[PDB]
């Protein structure tokens, strides 16, 4: 017999922030981004 | 046959064997072999950034 078991997590979180302001007039721009990639993997093989 | 003939006489050894037991011991025989094997791998990796 044998009992293979595998449990894999990959988590990624990536964030972007860009606030800007210009004046002489006034102008401003804010941008924000959040990204996530996730994978969960489970694999098993049992043989007798 | 009364005259010699290797074949016909050899059939006596084929059928009845070459010898007989003048004495001996009767009883029983036990033989065993057992062979267990086992292996175990564990992994517990953690990485963080």
Neighbouring residues of A43: CB distance < 8 A, sequence distance ≥ 6: A4, A5, A6
| DSSP assignment of chain B | --S--HHHHHHHHHHH-S---SS--------------------------
Collapse the DSSP code of A22 into the 3-class scheme (helix H, G, I; strand E, B; otherwise coil) and give the result.
strand
Contact criterion met (CB below 8 Å) for A43 and A3: no
Question: Resolution of this entry in Å?
Answer: 3.3
Residue B38 CA to residue A4 CA, distance in Å, equals 14
According to DSSP, the residues that pair with A42 across neighbouring strands are: A7
End-to-end CA distance of chain A: 4
Experimentally, the structure was elucidated by: cryo-EM
- Phi and psi (nearest 5°) for B11? -60, -25
Q: Please give the distance of CA A10 from its chain centroid, rounded to a whole number.
A: 9
According to DSSP, the residues that pair with A44 across neighbouring strands are: A5
Residue A34 CA to residue A20 CA, distance in Å, equals 18
């Amino acid at each position: 017999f044998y009992n293979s078991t595998w449990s894999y997590v990959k988590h990624t979180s990536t964030e972007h922030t860009s606030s800007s302001r210009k004046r002489s007039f006034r102008s401003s721009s804010s941008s924000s981004r959040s990204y996530t990639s996730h994978t969960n993997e489970i694999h098993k093989g049992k043989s007798y | 046959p009364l005259e010699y003939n290797s074949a016909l006489y050899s059939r006596i050894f084929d059928d009845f064997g070459t010898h007989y037991f003048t004495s001996g011991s009767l009883g029983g025989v036990y033989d065993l072999l057992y062979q267990f094997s086992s292996e175990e791998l564990k992994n517990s990796g953690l990485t963080e950034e």
